[PDB]
Amino acid sequence: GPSGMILKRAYDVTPQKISTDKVRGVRKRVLIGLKDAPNFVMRLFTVEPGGLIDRASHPWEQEIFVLKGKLTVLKEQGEETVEEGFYIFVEPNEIHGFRNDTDSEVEFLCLIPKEGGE
Amino acid sequence: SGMILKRAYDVTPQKISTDKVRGVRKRVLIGLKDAPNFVMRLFTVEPGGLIDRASHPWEQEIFVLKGKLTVLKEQGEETVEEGFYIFVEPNEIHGFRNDTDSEVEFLCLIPKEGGE
Ligand SMILES: [Cu+2]
Ligand SMILES: [Cu+2]
Ligand SMILES: [Cu+2]
């Protein structure tokens, strides 16, 4: 495929609202999406105060790096909070979700294999 | 287990010193033990550190976490800062340098064929 290198400020991508049965109070920037990625995509999620990505599972893994704020991670059993500078690996089919219990925005990078979309 | 949650700083960095890389530390956050498709590394470039120009058959996806990163391109260079992402196409010549007086950090992900 194509050659070259893209270098871009992530906030130059406008954050679009995500609203589904299980997600509320969340916006997403697609940084490296399906139109360019050979194997895996890179997104930057913003969780507004009180926002929720409720427990779910899916047949692909997820790799996360927390960029800003204190993120509550929902597990099959219970929950745990992480903050900026933590990573998360979610195996395929593992139950997971996320909540922002703070009064300021939380931001994290989220990468999945491109078979799971962008 | 099915979910790993960890502070990246606590992962032991590995010093890299070769003919092409000097003044660099690498943390393997999500490695080949765990990754079905792609791995997550965190690089720290010391002041004056260098990852010299190279290419490889796989792409790279980067997010700059701290500092001002100088990106070497096939010709010339471009400096970027915290908050930038970089997508390096397969086979594209690239490298990195830190011309500043403090450490630069970036997240780097590659498909598992590239190793960790
Ligand atoms: Cu998920
Ligand atoms: Cu499990
Ligand atoms: Cu490379």
CSV table of C-alpha atoms and ligand atoms in Angstrom, one decimal:
chain,number,residue,atom,x,y,z
A,1,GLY,CA,0.0,0.0,0.0
A,2,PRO,CA,0.8,3.7,0.4
A,3,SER,CA,4.0,5.1,1.7
A,4,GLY,CA,4.8,8.1,4.0
A,5,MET,CA,4.2,9.1,7.5
A,6,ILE,CA,1.4,11.1,9.1
A,7,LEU,CA,2.2,13.4,12.0
A,8,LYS,CA,-0.8,15.2,13.6
A,9,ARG,CA,-2.0,16.8,16.8
A,10,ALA,CA,-4.7,14.4,18.2
A,11,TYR,CA,-6.9,17.4,19.2
A,12,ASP,CA,-7.0,18.5,15.6
A,13,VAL,CA,-9.5,15.7,15.2
A,14,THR,CA,-13.0,16.9,16.3
A,15,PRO,CA,-14.4,14.7,19.2
A,16,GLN,CA,-17.6,12.9,18.0
A,17,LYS,CA,-20.4,11.8,20.3
A,18,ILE,CA,-20.9,8.1,21.0
A,19,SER,CA,-24.4,7.2,22.1
A,20,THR,CA,-25.5,3.6,22.2
A,21,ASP,CA,-27.5,1.5,24.7
A,22,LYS,CA,-24.4,0.9,26.7
A,23,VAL,CA,-22.5,4.2,26.2
A,24,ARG,CA,-23.4,7.7,27.3
A,25,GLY,CA,-21.2,10.7,28.0
A,26,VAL,CA,-18.4,9.7,25.7
A,27,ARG,CA,-16.7,11.2,22.7
A,28,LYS,CA,-14.2,9.6,20.3
A,29,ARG,CA,-11.5,10.8,18.0
A,30,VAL,CA,-10.4,8.4,15.3
A,31,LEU,CA,-6.6,9.0,15.0
A,32,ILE,CA,-5.6,6.0,12.8
A,33,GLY,CA,-8.7,4.5,11.3
A,34,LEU,CA,-9.9,1.9,8.9
A,35,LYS,CA,-9.1,4.0,5.8
A,36,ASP,CA,-5.4,3.9,6.6
A,37,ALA,CA,-4.6,1.1,9.1
A,38,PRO,CA,-3.1,-2.2,7.8
A,39,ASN,CA,-3.9,-4.1,11.0
A,40,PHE,CA,-5.1,-2.1,14.0
A,41,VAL,CA,-6.8,1.2,14.8
A,42,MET,CA,-6.0,4.0,17.2
A,43,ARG,CA,-8.7,6.0,18.9
A,44,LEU,CA,-8.7,8.7,21.6
A,45,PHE,CA,-11.7,8.5,23.9
A,46,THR,CA,-13.0,11.3,26.1
A,47,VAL,CA,-15.3,10.3,29.0
A,48,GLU,CA,-17.2,13.3,30.3
A,49,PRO,CA,-18.0,13.5,34.1
A,50,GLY,CA,-20.4,10.8,34.9
A,51,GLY,CA,-20.0,9.1,31.6
A,52,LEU,CA,-20.2,5.4,31.2
A,53,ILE,CA,-19.1,2.6,28.9
A,54,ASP,CA,-21.1,-0.2,30.5
A,55,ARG,CA,-19.9,-3.7,30.9
A,56,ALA,CA,-19.6,-5.6,27.6
A,57,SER,CA,-17.5,-8.2,25.9
A,58,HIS,CA,-16.5,-8.8,22.3
A,59,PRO,CA,-14.5,-11.3,20.3
A,60,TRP,CA,-11.4,-9.1,20.0
A,61,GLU,CA,-8.8,-7.8,22.4
A,62,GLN,CA,-8.4,-4.1,23.5
A,63,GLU,CA,-5.3,-2.2,24.4
A,64,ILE,CA,-5.6,1.0,26.4
A,65,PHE,CA,-3.3,3.7,27.7
A,66,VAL,CA,-4.7,6.3,30.1
A,67,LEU,CA,-3.7,9.8,29.1
A,68,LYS,CA,-5.6,12.1,31.6
A,69,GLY,CA,-7.6,11.7,34.7
A,70,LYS,CA,-8.9,8.9,37.0
A,71,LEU,CA,-10.7,6.1,35.2
A,72,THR,CA,-12.9,3.6,36.9
A,73,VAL,CA,-12.5,0.2,35.3
A,74,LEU,CA,-15.5,-2.2,35.5
A,75,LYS,CA,-14.5,-5.9,35.7
A,76,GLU,CA,-16.5,-9.1,35.7
A,77,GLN,CA,-16.1,-9.0,39.5
A,78,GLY,CA,-16.0,-5.5,40.9
A,79,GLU,CA,-14.2,-2.4,39.8
A,80,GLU,CA,-10.8,-0.7,40.2
A,81,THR,CA,-9.6,2.8,39.4
A,82,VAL,CA,-6.6,3.7,37.3
A,83,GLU,CA,-5.1,7.0,36.4
A,84,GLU,CA,-2.9,8.7,33.8
A,85,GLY,CA,0.1,6.5,32.9
A,86,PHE,CA,-1.7,3.2,33.4
A,87,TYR,CA,-2.1,0.6,30.6
A,88,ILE,CA,-4.9,-1.9,30.3
A,89,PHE,CA,-5.0,-5.2,28.3
A,90,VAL,CA,-8.4,-6.7,27.8
A,91,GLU,CA,-8.3,-10.3,26.4
A,92,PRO,CA,-10.9,-11.3,23.8
A,93,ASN,CA,-14.3,-12.0,25.4
A,94,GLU,CA,-13.4,-10.6,28.8
A,95,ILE,CA,-16.0,-8.5,30.5
A,96,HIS,CA,-15.0,-4.8,30.8
A,97,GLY,CA,-16.4,-1.3,31.0
A,98,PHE,CA,-15.4,2.2,32.1
A,99,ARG,CA,-16.9,5.0,34.2
A,100,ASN,CA,-15.8,8.5,35.1
A,101,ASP,CA,-16.7,9.2,38.7
A,102,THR,CA,-14.7,12.5,38.7
A,103,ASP,CA,-15.7,16.1,37.8
A,104,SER,CA,-13.2,16.5,35.0
A,105,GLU,CA,-12.8,14.7,31.6
A,106,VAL,CA,-10.9,11.5,31.4
A,107,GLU,CA,-9.0,10.6,28.2
A,108,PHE,CA,-7.5,7.3,27.0
A,109,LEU,CA,-6.1,5.8,23.9
A,110,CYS,CA,-7.8,2.6,22.8
A,111,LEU,CA,-6.5,0.3,20.1
A,112,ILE,CA,-8.3,-2.8,18.7
A,113,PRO,CA,-7.6,-5.0,15.7
A,114,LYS,CA,-9.3,-3.5,12.6
A,115,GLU,CA,-11.6,-6.5,12.3
A,116,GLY,CA,-13.5,-5.0,15.3
A,117,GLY,CA,-14.1,-1.6,13.4
A,118,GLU,CA,-13.0,1.8,14.4
B,1,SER,CA,-5.8,-12.6,34.0
B,2,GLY,CA,-8.3,-11.8,31.3
B,3,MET,CA,-7.5,-8.2,32.3
B,4,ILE,CA,-4.2,-6.6,33.1
B,5,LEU,CA,-4.2,-3.1,34.7
B,6,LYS,CA,-0.7,-1.7,35.5
B,7,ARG,CA,1.2,1.5,35.9
B,8,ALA,CA,3.6,1.8,32.9
B,9,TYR,CA,6.4,3.3,35.0
B,10,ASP,CA,6.5,0.1,37.1
B,11,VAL,CA,7.4,-2.0,34.0
B,12,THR,CA,11.2,-2.4,34.1
B,13,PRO,CA,12.8,-0.4,31.3
B,14,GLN,CA,15.3,-2.0,29.1
B,15,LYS,CA,18.4,0.0,28.1
B,16,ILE,CA,19.1,-0.1,24.4
B,17,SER,CA,22.6,0.6,23.2
B,18,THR,CA,23.5,-0.6,19.7
B,19,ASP,CA,25.2,0.9,16.6
B,20,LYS,CA,21.9,2.5,15.7
B,21,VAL,CA,20.3,3.2,19.1
B,22,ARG,CA,21.8,5.1,22.0
B,23,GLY,CA,20.3,6.9,25.0
B,24,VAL,CA,17.0,5.0,24.8
B,25,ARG,CA,15.0,2.9,27.3
B,26,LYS,CA,12.1,0.6,26.2
B,27,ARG,CA,9.2,-0.8,28.3
B,28,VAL,CA,7.2,-3.7,26.9
B,29,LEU,CA,3.8,-3.0,28.3
B,30,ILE,CA,1.7,-5.5,26.3
B,31,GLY,CA,4.1,-8.1,24.8
B,32,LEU,CA,4.1,-11.3,22.9
B,33,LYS,CA,3.0,-13.3,26.0
B,34,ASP,CA,-0.4,-11.6,25.9
B,35,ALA,CA,-1.0,-10.0,22.5
B,36,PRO,CA,-3.0,-11.8,19.8
B,37,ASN,CA,-2.2,-9.2,17.2
B,38,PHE,CA,-0.1,-6.2,18.2
B,39,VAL,CA,2.2,-5.1,21.0
B,40,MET,CA,2.5,-1.9,23.1
B,41,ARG,CA,5.8,-0.4,24.0
B,42,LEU,CA,6.8,2.8,25.8
B,43,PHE,CA,10.1,4.4,24.8
B,44,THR,CA,12.0,6.9,26.8
B,45,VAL,CA,14.6,9.0,24.9
B,46,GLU,CA,17.2,10.6,27.1
B,47,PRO,CA,18.6,14.1,26.2
B,48,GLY,CA,20.7,13.5,23.1
B,49,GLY,CA,19.3,10.0,22.5
B,50,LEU,CA,18.9,8.7,19.0
B,51,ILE,CA,17.0,6.0,17.2
B,52,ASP,CA,18.7,6.2,13.9
B,53,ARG,CA,17.0,5.9,10.5
B,54,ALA,CA,15.7,2.4,9.7
B,55,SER,CA,12.8,0.7,7.9
B,56,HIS,CA,10.8,-2.5,8.5
B,57,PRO,CA,8.1,-4.3,6.7
B,58,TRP,CA,5.4,-3.5,9.3
B,59,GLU,CA,3.7,-0.2,10.2
B,60,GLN,CA,4.1,1.7,13.5
B,61,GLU,CA,1.6,3.6,15.4
B,62,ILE,CA,2.9,6.2,17.9
B,63,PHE,CA,1.5,8.6,20.5
B,64,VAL,CA,3.9,11.2,21.9
B,65,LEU,CA,3.4,11.3,25.7
B,66,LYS,CA,6.0,13.8,26.9
B,67,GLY,CA,8.3,16.3,25.4
B,68,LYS,CA,9.5,17.4,22.0
B,69,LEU,CA,10.3,14.5,19.7
B,70,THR,CA,12.5,15.0,16.6
B,71,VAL,CA,11.3,12.6,13.9
B,72,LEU,CA,13.8,11.6,11.2
B,73,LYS,CA,12.3,11.1,7.8
B,74,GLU,CA,13.8,9.7,4.6
B,75,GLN,CA,14.9,13.2,3.9
B,76,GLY,CA,15.0,15.8,6.7
B,77,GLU,CA,13.3,15.9,10.0
B,78,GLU,CA,10.2,17.3,11.8
B,79,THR,CA,9.7,18.0,15.5
B,80,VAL,CA,6.5,17.2,17.2
B,81,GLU,CA,5.2,17.5,20.8
B,82,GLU,CA,3.2,15.7,23.4
B,83,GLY,CA,-0.3,15.1,22.1
B,84,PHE,CA,0.8,14.2,18.6
B,85,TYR,CA,0.2,10.9,17.0
B,86,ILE,CA,2.4,9.4,14.2
B,87,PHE,CA,1.5,6.7,11.7
B,88,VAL,CA,4.5,5.3,9.9
B,89,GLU,CA,3.5,3.3,6.8
B,90,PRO,CA,5.2,-0.1,6.2
B,91,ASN,CA,8.7,0.3,4.8
B,92,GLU,CA,8.9,4.1,5.4
B,93,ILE,CA,12.3,5.3,6.6
B,94,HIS,CA,12.0,6.8,10.1
B,95,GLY,CA,14.0,7.5,13.3
B,96,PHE,CA,13.9,9.7,16.3
B,97,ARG,CA,16.1,12.1,18.3
B,98,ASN,CA,15.8,14.1,21.5
B,99,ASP,CA,17.5,17.5,21.1
B,100,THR,CA,16.0,18.9,24.3
B,101,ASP,CA,17.4,18.9,27.9
B,102,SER,CA,14.7,16.6,29.3
B,103,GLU,CA,13.4,13.1,28.7
B,104,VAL,CA,10.9,12.4,25.9
B,105,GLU,CA,8.4,9.6,26.0
B,106,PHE,CA,6.3,8.0,23.4
B,107,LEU,CA,3.9,5.0,23.1
B,108,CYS,CA,4.8,2.7,20.1
B,109,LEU,CA,2.6,-0.1,18.8
B,110,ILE,CA,3.5,-2.6,16.1
B,111,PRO,CA,2.0,-5.8,14.8
B,112,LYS,CA,3.3,-8.9,16.6
B,113,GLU,CA,5.4,-10.0,13.5
B,114,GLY,CA,7.7,-7.1,14.5
B,115,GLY,CA,8.5,-8.6,17.9
B,116,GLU,CA,8.3,-6.7,21.1
C,1,CU,CU,-14.6,-3.1,24.6
C,2,CU,CU,-11.6,-13.7,32.3
C,3,CU,CU,10.5,1.5,13.5
